[PDB]
């Protein structure tokens, strides 16, 4: 994932 | 700086000090992602 921000979205 | 007459080429080696740091992390099975900030003299536009 990411450490800076916990945001993630499908497309 | 007012260094003393040496005689031949001579580079002074100021070592401006900052905070180096890395935050390696492996969320999945085989993904390395890390931040590499160095303050007081960083790297970024």
């Amino acid at each position: 994932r990411s450490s800076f921000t916990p945001r993630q979205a499908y497309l | 700086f007012e260094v003393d007459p040496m005689d031949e080429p001579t580079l002074l080696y100021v070592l401006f000090e900052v905070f180096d740091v890395v935050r390696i992390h492996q969320p999945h099975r085989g993904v390395i992602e890390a931040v590499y900030l160095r303050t007081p003299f960083s790297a970024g536009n």
Binding site: - | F1, E2, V3, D4, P5, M6, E8, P9, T10, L11, L12, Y13, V14, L15, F16, E17, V18, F19, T39, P40, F41
Partner: protein, 49 residues
Amino acid sequence: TSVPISIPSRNWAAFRGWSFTRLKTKETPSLGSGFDPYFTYSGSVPYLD
């Protein structure tokens, strides 16, 4: 006998202190290019020694 240095408009935020020193050229290596031929010393490298 001098070394006018400078750095413009920084944002010193955790600058925890300078550290002077003084190398000699021949024997301080060329920085990172590769085969920098102007390196003709075999002795200690005060830059990375």
